[PDB]
Amino acid sequence: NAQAEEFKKYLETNGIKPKQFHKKELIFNQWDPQEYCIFLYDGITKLTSISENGTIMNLQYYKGAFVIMSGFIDTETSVGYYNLEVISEQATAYVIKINELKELLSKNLTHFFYVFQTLQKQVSYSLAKFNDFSINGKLGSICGQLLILTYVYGKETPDGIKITLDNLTMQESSAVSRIISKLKQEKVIVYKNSCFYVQNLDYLKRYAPKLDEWFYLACPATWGKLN
Amino acid sequence: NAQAEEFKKYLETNGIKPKQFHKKELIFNQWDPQEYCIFLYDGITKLTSISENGTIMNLQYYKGAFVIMSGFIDTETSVGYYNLEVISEQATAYVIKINELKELLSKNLTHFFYVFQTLQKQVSYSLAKFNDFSINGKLGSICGQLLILTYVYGKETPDGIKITLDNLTMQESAVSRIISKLKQEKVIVYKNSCFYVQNLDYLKRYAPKLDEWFYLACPATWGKLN
């Protein structure tokens, strides 16, 4: 994005050096007492938690450019015991402590608005998901799931709309299996060339309406390029 | 909430007057093209959405003091077409136009951080609810619901902690059968026309991530019940 690139150049102008990360590396762990504000620029990461039994609970996924924070900005206290695990073979991020951020945004309010609107996107996104879930069960959950991924990785090909993303990450359960079974049968999706294809976007729009509306409102350009 | 009092003063000094609202009344609705910023100073409300088939789904609940925004702060576009209805018998709130909020927050960094941290509280709440759900099924969600309920309105009693709230706010098929299971196991019991806690441990156990979220986001309120 453009605003994201401008914020990148701003951070670099204030001495924030971009750091690389190999897959599985922890950008920050739940035990680190330092509250960060990771501005993921390139790659993909996952926010996870770990319960008592030690099981890894994948909470959310983020694809740069995006902003993640381990502490509240007002009180600088932690927002949770989270772990930001990278999942791309090589990612590029900008790690900053909480106070350095706060002062940067205190002198330049445009980027303050940028990150503010990022968080608004995240909250309305959770809301649209929960709405699609409430109104159309796991069908709508799955429909919105692959709807967002075809919007962000949609390539209008003669065979429909190819999903331009690494198959390995795409791979990354009886109900969902039956649902995607009827999706494959009904033609709305096809597994040609072992790459996930989508040919009936209106079907995804119908049963994941609120996510579609969220994508239109928060990402109007990328939404319009496929309508 | 000390931060909310200062925000109230800072809004009123800039000519923003408190507004009153009654039950079943909407502070902003779905099709309103004007984007707002509601500072719910007092009262309880629910954010709902009406589907094209007329069905109304309840999406979120909010309690004062809190901040709920209907558009993006800079571009003033809608963030989502939603309705904010009042569920408490009465509520007080300040309604700010999105551009006016942009100006006011650009005129003061402290309250900027305040609204930003309310958004962060929302994000971490969603993450915690999702964790409890993905772990303990649909039981974790209702467990977290009852947990935060007890924390916000819990009052110590010899029988057990109790929520002091009218029966209306309390009430507001399979989920009901799960309530039956919990009531039979006696996680909480109903007496004297009111709901009474028995063992808060069950909820903390089956709604863990939300307990963490409430400990680190509302430590003062969390402490008194622990």
Binding site: Q60, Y61, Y62, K63, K121, Q145, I148, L149 | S134
Partner: peptide, 4 residues
């Protein structure tokens, strides 16, 4: 659940 969901790549934002």
């Amino acid at each position: 659940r969901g790549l934002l």
